[PDB]
Amino acid sequence: PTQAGISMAASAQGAMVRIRNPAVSSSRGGITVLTHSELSAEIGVTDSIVVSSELVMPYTVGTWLRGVAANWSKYSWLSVRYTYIPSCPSSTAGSIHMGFQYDMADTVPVSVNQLSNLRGYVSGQVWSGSAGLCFINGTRCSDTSTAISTTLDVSKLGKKWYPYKTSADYATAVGVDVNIATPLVPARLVIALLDGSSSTAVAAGRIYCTYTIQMIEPTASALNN
Amino acid sequence: GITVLTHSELSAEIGVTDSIVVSSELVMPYTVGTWLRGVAANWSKYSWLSVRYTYIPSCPSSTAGSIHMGFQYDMADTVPVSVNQLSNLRGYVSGQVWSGSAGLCFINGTRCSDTSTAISTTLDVSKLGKKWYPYKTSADYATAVGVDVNIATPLVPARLVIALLDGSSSTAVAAGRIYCTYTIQMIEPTASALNN
Amino acid sequence: GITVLTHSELSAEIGVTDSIVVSSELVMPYTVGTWLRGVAANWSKYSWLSVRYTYIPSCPSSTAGSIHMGFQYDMADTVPVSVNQLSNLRGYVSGQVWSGSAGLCFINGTRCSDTSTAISTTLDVSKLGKKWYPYKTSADYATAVGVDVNIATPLVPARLVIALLDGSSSTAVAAGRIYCTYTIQMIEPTASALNN
Amino acid sequence: GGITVLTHSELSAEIGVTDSIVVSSELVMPYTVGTWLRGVAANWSKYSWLSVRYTYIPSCPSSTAGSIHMGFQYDMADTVPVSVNQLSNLRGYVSGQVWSGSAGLCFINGTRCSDTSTAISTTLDVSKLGKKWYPYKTSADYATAVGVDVNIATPLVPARLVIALLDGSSSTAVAAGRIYCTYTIQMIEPTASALNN
Amino acid sequence: PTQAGISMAASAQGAMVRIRNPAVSSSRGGITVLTHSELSAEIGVTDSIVVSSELVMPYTVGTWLRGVAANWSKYSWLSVRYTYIPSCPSSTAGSIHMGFQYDMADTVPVSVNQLSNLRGYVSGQVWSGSAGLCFINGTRCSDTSTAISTTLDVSKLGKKWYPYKTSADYATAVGVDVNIATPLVPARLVIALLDGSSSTAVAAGRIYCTYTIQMIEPTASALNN
Amino acid sequence: GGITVLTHSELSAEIGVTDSIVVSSELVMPYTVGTWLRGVAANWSKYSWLSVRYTYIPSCPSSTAGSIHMGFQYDMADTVPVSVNQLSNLRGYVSGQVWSGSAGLCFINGTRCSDTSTAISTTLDVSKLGKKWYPYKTSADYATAVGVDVNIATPLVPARLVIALLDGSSSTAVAAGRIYCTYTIQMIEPTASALNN
Ligand SMILES: [Ca+2]
Ligand SMILES: [Ca+2]
Ligand SMILES: [Ca+2]
Ligand SMILES: [Ca+2]
Ligand SMILES: [Ca+2]
Ligand SMILES: [Ca+2]
């Protein structure tokens, strides 16, 4: 693109990811702030729709964050962002879909449509979204009108302060009744993948999450459940 | 970036007897009334802004019987059993099954001057558990409470308790109706058929 | 360069029963009342400015039964069938067939302070289909709707739905009356006998 | 006061891409824009469009030959375009390659829009519609009315979106993209859900 | 392209077309000026050469222009431009060819060669020409050295003023003898498509025409033939 | 207006001093803080902590070997500290000789506090609690709920006070001191006494 309205589709997009060292700061008053990025999930697309879901809580979001936040009893999301990066060619067939849900009791979407309604929805070709790189690496952002990434509206969730929960104990409590969950986690991410070309899954891309968290009220790592 | 509406609708039809009859309504969207149920369901959460349960008679000057309403918030708390019990709960209200004729203005918001008579009460949104509650279905709620009641205080805000007595007969009598005049902020949209 | 008047007149006499009785009135000049019918007909068009249907009892303290009114605008919409249905429609209103005694002041516009009790509602001229509707006759209207209902939303603004129940008997009972207090702008004159 | 204002963005129609110019049309009214709104808008008798915007969003390979077209008609009586040519005349004519438009995305999530010149999307000229307020009509009852005479519809629906999907590479369908609608609406004069037609 | 001489071919080109409202102006003296753009024709390419021809007169050029100019007895072309937009991938095989002829009696070209000689000739890959978008949308023009579009040299035709003719009556008159046509239409566009890959036609692109016309001497729409 | 604000100071728990580290815990809620408040708070459905402060006050000889520890946990699901070490991590960890703290006294009678550095006392960080308002829960009903699953408690109680009483000189108990609580509370949504659970 030189003029206006003209667009050139590459044979394939490429984004070189480099995650910078974590950012931690113990701000007097109690809170310890952490802002970091981590590869949150691996993606694959098929000709039939597939709905994947991931809880947006510490233990689940980040693999590093898991071990970190463990030393604090509570936490408050300050900014959670799931960005998508395509690791395939434009010759690949397929689209992605993401959005959030807030009451785990609600059934998980089953149509690209139902999902179009969720909060912070996003769709786009499996081979696009490279634009969002500047988010993950943390550089100066250019044109993001083409990027595939959504953010959690921390502005309005159940509480500001949630308890650090462990996948294990969590599930155990959800086993009793799902509902016990709402006071354990803010919301969850919904991810759909359809419009693919083969019955056997194909390498689509990957989703990195870049968050900023507040951690409070310390505890021995192993005393936390 | 939300969506806010205000409306009024019959929340439940009332009948009086010779003995006390204690009933209760959750103050959540699904259980307030038909309309707000079928709508608010298209949003994952919601926050009460102004809940008002108003009673409005349907009987003759000559139809002995009174009515009582109040609130409760810790669902685990035992449901009242005497008119006295109910007098204690917050935002109480008593009156003859045929009174409250004036509580009408509350539903067609106009020049509401004379509202002393009015048999209606208001939910103190000002301070309930959380501020944003998730939309729940009659079904899924009872299901969860079936385990333990307390899983409810994080699911609903409070519930309106009601009692009718000092009736003319021992068999139900055409009393009146309770309408709810609510204003709500609903958010985080979702396919209607997906909400539980 | 128009012509504007304001008046009030009996729009329909009411009766209550043991079962629900749903009736409806178009909110067009011809169907509001005798007077405004025989006048507004001398003008091709008209625009509502303030429509108010007010109920006024005629029975004794002891005459069980309630009354309900609300509006609808897409004539094609199905006419309500339960008190609940009617509670949903806009500008609802409920009350005992003997109440509304105070809705009187609305017809002899004076010092209307106490109007809570008042069983009356208002048409939101503020926003209906068109702003200038043509004067139509009961006859010619039904004739056109006989083809398809929808030819009506361009002919009338909205219609008032009414229901009466919780009655004392199973055979009509002297209830009250509904009067209409309207203010209208009528234009583009025409021989009375020519309007359809 | 009195009204109620929803502003949302949901899938309005999935698109199949072929070689034989198939031409469709959707009414620009609540019951038709999308499933979600259809569900809500029902609780209100009339409504008025404030800002209606259909936006095409791809979901296919770059190796997918094809172009898509959109436009508006307002006298429901007019004959739906027979040729894409005829279509290129309508108000808000727009057309691009069935795999481009990736940029239009900023209309669906309501983010900060950078350059939207490459976005396959058109809007509704609300200021020039017959009535300000329309009646919520169900596809059913509408058809029944247009059955007697189409003109009885000009007062039930503001406009119609004409969509053409020509140029492809195969004789059968190939999933291409979706057309989401991002509308701002004023819903009024509430009513029981099942009583609306 | 950063340096000079280096060129990058996209997997596929994309041009988002948006036609702006017509431009009409009744300039005292008689003439009514109209400048508008319309999708003039649909394109397809095959392995064997195909020669298409379109008269460059009101009734034929534009589908809207047809109904408009009907209300005037004569017209004078002021600027006629046929632009091409590719709606396919660079992986597609094929080239286009356009030019003008002025004496309908002349036989229609049959070789990409003969056509190379015509006035305002143009050739180019079926999947290119996206550059010309700025013409149709009517934006600021960038590098057009790559665009596939030609213009009618209004400077030198039979008359300046031609009569509005209808396809019907026209053909009827040409049925008598083709020659009667020269005083009925200025010239015509020739379009060839060969160098394709399949025997069965493939979706190539589409040709939009952007013209500026002068219309004069009014008449009841239906009295015009 | 509407609320009701009590601010009081009563014995929250008597302390026995031994040599084998015995570790206890008390919920930081009305029914558990103390007998008096338990009695009042019942007349109100919900409540919100404004300022909670547990203070240890001796009542033994200076020849009484022993140390006491206090701290807070908030995810009721977490395992109550097994070692005093684990405890020294919690928010508001504090610990001193079971005969000192004489100075903390100025927290109970509400007098003018001179130097309180030697006082064995910690406070509750109210600004960082899950909910602002909690439901008054009876130990009974609470246990019954945590019986099904502990997590069902995180929304019933703000935090838990972990107390450790290690280091002593005898194998049996020796009266050491008391932990009084000095709280300021907002009681709301009144209710019949016996109807609260
Ligand atoms: Ca924990
Ligand atoms: Ca829900
Ligand atoms: Ca007339
Ligand atoms: Ca309707
Ligand atoms: Ca002619
Ligand atoms: Ca309680």
PDB file of C-alpha atoms in Angstrom, chain B residues 55-170:
ATOM      1  CA  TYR B  55     -48.331  -3.829  45.731  1.00  0.00           C
ATOM      2  CA  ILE B  56     -51.639  -2.886  44.077  1.00  0.00           C
ATOM      3  CA  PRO B  57     -55.034  -4.183  45.343  1.00  0.00           C
ATOM      4  CA  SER B  58     -57.779  -5.799  43.240  1.00  0.00           C
ATOM      5  CA  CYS B  59     -60.434  -6.256  45.898  1.00  0.00           C
ATOM      6  CA  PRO B  60     -63.366  -4.377  47.519  1.00  0.00           C
ATOM      7  CA  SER B  61     -63.259  -1.964  50.501  1.00  0.00           C
ATOM      8  CA  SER B  62     -64.727  -4.919  52.367  1.00  0.00           C
ATOM      9  CA  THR B  63     -62.062  -7.626  52.083  1.00  0.00           C
ATOM     10  CA  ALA B  64     -60.242  -8.041  55.399  1.00  0.00           C
ATOM     11  CA  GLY B  65     -56.624  -9.124  55.275  1.00  0.00           C
ATOM     12  CA  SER B  66     -53.219  -7.466  55.388  1.00  0.00           C
ATOM     13  CA  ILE B  67     -49.948  -7.820  53.496  1.00  0.00           C
ATOM     14  CA  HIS B  68     -46.314  -7.601  54.515  1.00  0.00           C
ATOM     15  CA  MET B  69     -43.020  -7.282  52.740  1.00  0.00           C
ATOM     16  CA  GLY B  70     -39.398  -6.847  53.651  1.00  0.00           C
ATOM     17  CA  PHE B  71     -35.926  -7.904  52.584  1.00  0.00           C
ATOM     18  CA  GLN B  72     -33.245 -10.409  53.512  1.00  0.00           C
ATOM     19  CA  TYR B  73     -29.744 -10.810  52.086  1.00  0.00           C
ATOM     20  CA  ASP B  74     -28.016 -13.863  53.557  1.00  0.00           C
ATOM     21  CA  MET B  75     -30.108 -16.437  51.802  1.00  0.00           C
ATOM     22  CA  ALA B  76     -29.040 -18.877  54.544  1.00  0.00           C
ATOM     23  CA  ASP B  77     -30.970 -16.719  57.071  1.00  0.00           C
ATOM     24  CA  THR B  78     -34.230 -18.442  57.997  1.00  0.00           C
ATOM     25  CA  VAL B  79     -37.360 -17.169  56.278  1.00  0.00           C
ATOM     26  CA  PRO B  80     -39.633 -15.216  58.706  1.00  0.00           C
ATOM     27  CA  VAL B  81     -42.648 -16.918  60.250  1.00  0.00           C
ATOM     28  CA  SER B  82     -44.543 -14.241  62.201  1.00  0.00           C
ATOM     29  CA  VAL B  83     -45.694 -10.761  61.237  1.00  0.00           C
ATOM     30  CA  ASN B  84     -43.292  -9.597  63.918  1.00  0.00           C
ATOM     31  CA  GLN B  85     -40.306 -11.364  62.354  1.00  0.00           C
ATOM     32  CA  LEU B  86     -41.123  -9.595  59.120  1.00  0.00           C
ATOM     33  CA  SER B  87     -41.476  -6.210  60.817  1.00  0.00           C
ATOM     34  CA  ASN B  88     -37.801  -6.473  61.735  1.00  0.00           C
ATOM     35  CA  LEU B  89     -36.362  -7.155  58.222  1.00  0.00           C
ATOM     36  CA  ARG B  90     -35.252  -3.989  56.329  1.00  0.00           C
ATOM     37  CA  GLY B  91     -37.691  -1.763  54.473  1.00  0.00           C
ATOM     38  CA  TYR B  92     -40.787  -3.292  56.034  1.00  0.00           C
ATOM     39  CA  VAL B  93     -44.293  -2.479  54.946  1.00  0.00           C
ATOM     40  CA  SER B  94     -47.789  -3.423  56.109  1.00  0.00           C
ATOM     41  CA  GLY B  95     -51.293  -2.540  54.964  1.00  0.00           C
ATOM     42  CA  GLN B  96     -54.790  -3.793  54.196  1.00  0.00           C
ATOM     43  CA  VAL B  97     -55.067  -6.054  51.147  1.00  0.00           C
ATOM     44  CA  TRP B  98     -57.342  -3.422  49.620  1.00  0.00           C
ATOM     45  CA  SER B  99     -55.087  -0.463  50.385  1.00  0.00           C
ATOM     46  CA  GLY B 100     -52.092   0.790  48.401  1.00  0.00           C
ATOM     47  CA  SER B 101     -54.390   2.074  45.681  1.00  0.00           C
ATOM     48  CA  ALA B 102     -51.988   5.007  45.403  1.00  0.00           C
ATOM     49  CA  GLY B 103     -48.855   2.954  44.903  1.00  0.00           C
ATOM     50  CA  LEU B 104     -49.916   3.173  41.256  1.00  0.00           C
ATOM     51  CA  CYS B 105     -48.141   6.437  40.401  1.00  0.00           C
ATOM     52  CA  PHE B 106     -44.899   4.531  41.059  1.00  0.00           C
ATOM     53  CA  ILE B 107     -45.437   2.550  37.839  1.00  0.00           C
ATOM     54  CA  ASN B 108     -46.433   5.438  35.561  1.00  0.00           C
ATOM     55  CA  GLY B 109     -43.862   7.899  36.914  1.00  0.00           C
ATOM     56  CA  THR B 110     -45.698  11.254  36.967  1.00  0.00           C
ATOM     57  CA  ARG B 111     -46.547  13.792  39.680  1.00  0.00           C
ATOM     58  CA  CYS B 112     -46.237  11.450  42.671  1.00  0.00           C
ATOM     59  CA  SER B 113     -47.263  13.700  45.556  1.00  0.00           C
ATOM     60  CA  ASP B 114     -49.537  11.528  47.701  1.00  0.00           C
ATOM     61  CA  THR B 115     -47.612   8.326  48.405  1.00  0.00           C
ATOM     62  CA  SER B 116     -48.051   7.938  52.146  1.00  0.00           C
ATOM     63  CA  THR B 117     -50.735   5.295  51.650  1.00  0.00           C
ATOM     64  CA  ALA B 118     -48.534   3.588  49.014  1.00  0.00           C
ATOM     65  CA  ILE B 119     -47.552   0.012  49.802  1.00  0.00           C
ATOM     66  CA  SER B 120     -44.214  -0.307  48.075  1.00  0.00           C
ATOM     67  CA  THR B 121     -40.556  -0.782  49.054  1.00  0.00           C
ATOM     68  CA  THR B 122     -37.072  -0.249  47.556  1.00  0.00           C
ATOM     69  CA  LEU B 123     -33.842  -2.359  47.340  1.00  0.00           C
ATOM     70  CA  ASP B 124     -30.879  -0.467  48.723  1.00  0.00           C
ATOM     71  CA  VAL B 125     -28.584  -0.948  45.703  1.00  0.00           C
ATOM     72  CA  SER B 126     -26.394   1.426  47.662  1.00  0.00           C
ATOM     73  CA  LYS B 127     -24.850  -1.598  49.449  1.00  0.00           C
ATOM     74  CA  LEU B 128     -25.371  -5.291  48.599  1.00  0.00           C
ATOM     75  CA  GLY B 129     -22.740  -8.035  48.359  1.00  0.00           C
ATOM     76  CA  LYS B 130     -21.094  -7.499  44.965  1.00  0.00           C
ATOM     77  CA  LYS B 131     -22.111  -4.695  42.560  1.00  0.00           C
ATOM     78  CA  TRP B 132     -22.127  -6.792  39.400  1.00  0.00           C
ATOM     79  CA  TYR B 133     -24.074 -10.033  39.685  1.00  0.00           C
ATOM     80  CA  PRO B 134     -24.168 -12.762  37.006  1.00  0.00           C
ATOM     81  CA  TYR B 135     -27.476 -13.634  35.349  1.00  0.00           C
ATOM     82  CA  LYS B 136     -28.745 -16.932  36.671  1.00  0.00           C
ATOM     83  CA  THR B 137     -31.656 -19.216  35.801  1.00  0.00           C
ATOM     84  CA  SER B 138     -34.289 -20.420  38.284  1.00  0.00           C
ATOM     85  CA  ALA B 139     -33.073 -23.879  37.395  1.00  0.00           C
ATOM     86  CA  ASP B 140     -29.309 -23.534  37.754  1.00  0.00           C
ATOM     87  CA  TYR B 141     -29.770 -21.572  40.980  1.00  0.00           C
ATOM     88  CA  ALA B 142     -31.888 -24.079  42.881  1.00  0.00           C
ATOM     89  CA  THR B 143     -29.520 -26.746  41.562  1.00  0.00           C
ATOM     90  CA  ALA B 144     -26.571 -25.022  43.229  1.00  0.00           C
ATOM     91  CA  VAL B 145     -28.425 -24.197  46.425  1.00  0.00           C
ATOM     92  CA  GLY B 146     -29.393 -27.849  46.557  1.00  0.00           C
ATOM     93  CA  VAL B 147     -25.795 -28.384  47.630  1.00  0.00           C
ATOM     94  CA  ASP B 148     -25.590 -25.595  50.179  1.00  0.00           C
ATOM     95  CA  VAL B 149     -27.588 -22.429  50.494  1.00  0.00           C
ATOM     96  CA  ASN B 150     -24.494 -20.248  50.908  1.00  0.00           C
ATOM     97  CA  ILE B 151     -23.432 -20.728  47.321  1.00  0.00           C
ATOM     98  CA  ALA B 152     -26.260 -18.255  46.794  1.00  0.00           C
ATOM     99  CA  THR B 153     -25.015 -15.052  48.446  1.00  0.00           C
ATOM    100  CA  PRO B 154     -22.457 -14.776  45.632  1.00  0.00           C
ATOM    101  CA  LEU B 155     -25.137 -15.524  42.982  1.00  0.00           C
ATOM    102  CA  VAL B 156     -28.040 -13.177  44.040  1.00  0.00           C
ATOM    103  CA  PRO B 157     -28.238  -9.821  45.942  1.00  0.00           C
ATOM    104  CA  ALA B 158     -31.186 -10.278  48.281  1.00  0.00           C
ATOM    105  CA  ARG B 159     -34.738 -11.605  48.310  1.00  0.00           C
ATOM    106  CA  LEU B 160     -38.120 -10.101  49.099  1.00  0.00           C
ATOM    107  CA  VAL B 161     -40.069 -11.918  51.823  1.00  0.00           C
ATOM    108  CA  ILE B 162     -43.865 -11.706  51.849  1.00  0.00           C
ATOM    109  CA  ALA B 163     -46.725 -12.666  54.121  1.00  0.00           C
ATOM    110  CA  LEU B 164     -50.514 -12.421  54.050  1.00  0.00           C
ATOM    111  CA  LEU B 165     -52.927 -12.931  56.913  1.00  0.00           C
ATOM    112  CA  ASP B 166     -55.969 -11.657  58.800  1.00  0.00           C
ATOM    113  CA  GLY B 167     -57.983 -13.005  55.884  1.00  0.00           C
ATOM    114  CA  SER B 168     -61.733 -13.382  55.477  1.00  0.00           C
ATOM    115  CA  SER B 169     -61.678 -17.085  54.579  1.00  0.00           C
ATOM    116  CA  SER B 170     -59.615 -20.283  54.831  1.00  0.00           C
TER     117      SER B 170
END
